[PDB]
Structure formats: structure tokens, C-alpha cells
């Protein structure tokens, strides 16, 4: 019910982010972002909690050469919360999911943003910690 607020978008189309799940992918290459209507000359961009379409560049041979739905769980670009806190992570990370938001893997490495955690209960259950 409660809607997520706008946050700074740090991951434009073309960003390679780490893969923080045990699927086998070592990184995720963003090719689009769900919900982006956009405008002329502007790259679609993503932030923690956003579902994106990505391809695996480094990882299991069976996982590559195809487009996966993924969700960004960490980003290096600091973003303001409504309690005034500017938070940023050591690295950019995502997890592969399906259309329904269920993790293709079964575990996550590293913390997950509270912004993405509250939006994806399937992702939250696998998070070791929440930032």
C-alpha cells in the first residue's frame, strides 16, 4: 500500500553491477528499467528497489546470452531518505528474479537496502541484513 519515494538513480542503462545471489551469475548488465517512459536522449536509469532487465556477462554458460529480470539491492550513489539520511553502499548489486519477484537463487551476499527490502518480500526473506 505505502508507495516508495523517489531516490537518486545511479545505474543508467549500460551499467554492470555485481550479482549478489547464488544463481551463478557474477555480474548483471542493465539493458532497460521497468516503468521507464523516458524522454528524448535520456538513458533509462535504476535505483535500489527497481526491477530491471539485464544480461549476465560473467558467470555460468547457461545463464548468459539471454535477458533476465533483476532487482537492484545496493547502489554506490547516495540517496536521501525521508528521515534526512544520505546512504550509499560500497558497490552496486542486484539479484535475478522472475516477473513475480521471486529470486531465481536462494541466498544473498551482503546487505540489502531498506528501500528494496520493503518492496520485494521474496527478496527480503533471503537478505542477511537490511541497510
Amino acid at each position: 500500500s505505502g508507495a516508495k519515494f523517489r531516490i537518486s538513480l545511479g545505474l543508467p542503462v549500460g551499467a554492470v553491477i555485481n550479482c549478489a545471489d547464488n544463481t551463478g551469475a557474477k555480474n548483471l548488465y542493465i539493458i532497460s528499467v521497468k516503468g521507464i517512459k523516458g524522454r528524448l536522449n535520456r538513458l533509462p536509469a535504476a535505483g535500489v528497489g527497481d526491477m530491471v532487465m539485464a544480461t549476465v556477462k560473467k558467470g555460468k554458460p547457461e545463464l548468459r546470452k539471454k535477458v533476465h529480470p533483476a532487482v537492484v539491492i545496493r547502489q554506490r550513489k547516495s540517496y536521501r531518505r525521508k528521515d534526512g539520511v544520505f546512504l550509499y553502499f560500497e558497490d552496486n548489486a542486484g539479484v535475478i528474479v522472475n516477473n513475480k519477484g521471486e529470486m531465481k537463487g536462494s541466498a544473498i551476499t551482503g546487505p540489502v537496502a531498506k528501500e528494496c527490502a520493503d518492496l520485494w518480500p521474496r527478496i527480503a526473506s533471503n537478505a542477511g541484513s537490511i541497510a
Binding site: 539520511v85 544520505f86 553502499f89 560500497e90 551482503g110 541497510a131
Partner: protein, 63 residues
Amino acid sequence: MKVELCSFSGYKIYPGHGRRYARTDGKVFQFLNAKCESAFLSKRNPRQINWTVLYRRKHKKGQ
């Protein structure tokens, strides 16, 4: 809102100041400003920086 303390200098951070840092290992740090943040990220020891709480406590300057 509760006040934090800079993970480098020991100064306390009031709401709407500094940046919160979160490493891939799970530890979360708060920094009063970019002066403190840069020293922390360059792997400087606060105990060796004259103007920090950890330095003055190690050298008994207040005491």
C-alpha cells in the same frame, strides 16, 4: 530522532548531516562530513589524527 557518532572523529551527527556508509560485509558507518569520510576511506587511523575524539582520549588531552 536519535543522534549518531561519526565513525572516524567521534563527533555526534544531528539529523540531516553527513552520510551513512554500508559496506558489503554488513558494517554500517556514519560520517559527520566529507573530511571525516575521506580519512576513513583512505584507511587512516583516527587515533593518529590530532582533532579526533579517539586521539584526545588516547593522549589524555582533555584529562
